[PDB]
Amino acid sequence: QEQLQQPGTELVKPGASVRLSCKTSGYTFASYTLHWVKQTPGQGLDWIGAIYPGNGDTSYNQKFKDKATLTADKSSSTAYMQLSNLTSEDSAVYYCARLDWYFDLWGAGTTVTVSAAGSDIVLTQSPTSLAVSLGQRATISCKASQSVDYDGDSYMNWYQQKPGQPPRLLIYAASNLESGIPARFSGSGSGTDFTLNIHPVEEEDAATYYCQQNNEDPRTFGGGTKLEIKLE
Ligand SMILES: [Cl-]
Numbered sequence: 001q002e003q004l005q006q007p008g009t010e011l012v013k014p015g016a017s018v019r020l021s022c023k024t025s026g027y028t029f030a031s032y033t034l035h036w037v038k039q040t041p042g043q044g045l046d047w048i049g050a051i052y053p054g055n056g057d058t059s060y061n062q063k064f065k066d067k068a069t070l071t072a073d074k075s076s077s078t079a080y081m082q083l084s085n086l087t088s089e090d091s092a093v094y095y096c097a098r099l100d101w102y103f104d105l106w107g108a109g110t111t112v113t114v115s116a117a118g119s120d121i122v123l124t125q126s127p128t129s130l131a132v133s134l135g136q137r138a139t140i141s142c143k144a145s146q147s148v149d150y151d152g153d154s155y156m157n158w159y160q161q162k163p164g165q166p167p168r169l170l171i172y173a174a175s176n177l178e179s180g181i182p183a184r185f186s187g188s189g190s191g192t193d194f195t196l197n198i199h200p201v202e203e204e205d206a207a208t209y210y211c212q213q214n215n216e217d218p219r220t221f222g223g224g225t226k227l228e229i230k231l232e
């Protein structure tokens with residue numbers, strides 16, 4: 001099967017550099033763009049940049065242009081991201097992924113822990129945490145600072161990350177369930193306003209949910225909503 005394999009942890013000093021690896025298998029490495037994404041508790045997910053492995057071409061979010069360097073090694077089907085001049089603000093989890101919905105694939109992420117004891121579109125999620133009883137409804141809003149529609153399609157997806165598991169696509173283009181996603185999930189919305197609904201909620205639905213837009217560069221994500229089960 002198709003896999004993106006990333007090391008679990010890197011424990012690193014301020015001021016050093018670290019190289020993160022993403023070993024791919026199961027498909028032709030050279031033919032699909034790979035993207036790197038930073039996750040933190042307060043800021044949700046941040047798109048770092050992308051590489052086309054076939055030729056090594058790269059694109060970077062302006063905010064990461066000095067911090068990250070993406071490379072690819074066709075001989076080992078492995079992509080790498082170097083993070084330079086590490087600071088405490090680099091502590092985070094970093095994922096490699098195929099982000100276009102039709103090819104959705106995520107690595108499990110590398111935690112980078114920097115340790116020393118001593119006009120982008122903004123997406124706002126509401127609420128940012130909620131507890132819902134088994135059998136009841138969860139409803140989560142995502143609102144964009146500008147329209148994410150083109151030609152009557154909404155270039156917005158929802159992602160789910162269950163505890164201990166990689167993120168995965170949940171709904172694409174506002175209202176379409178990804179293959180294998182249960183019927184109790186539904187998405188609505190257009191323009192700047194989108195809503196995820198889950199009913200009836202089951203235990204397996206405890207997760208962090210993120211919206212994402214890909215109408216304009218850079219791709220951006222909401223800060224995440226953590227759904228837990230309200231024990232009765
Ligand atoms: Cl290849």
Ligand SMILES: [Cl-]
Nearest residue numbers: 058059060061
């Ligand atoms: Cl660039």
Ligand SMILES: [Cl-]
Nearest residue numbers: 125126127128
């Ligand atoms: Cl809120």
Ligand SMILES: [Cl-]
Nearest residue numbers: 149150151152
């Ligand atoms: Cl439109």
Ligand SMILES: [Cl-]
Nearest residue numbers: 182183184185
């Ligand atoms: Cl269901």
Ligand SMILES: [Cl-]
Nearest residue numbers: 124125222223
């Ligand atoms: Cl948010």
Ligand code: NA
Nearest residue numbers: 024025029077
């Ligand atoms: Na390969």
Ligand code: NA
Nearest residue numbers: 125126127141
């Ligand atoms: Na609100």
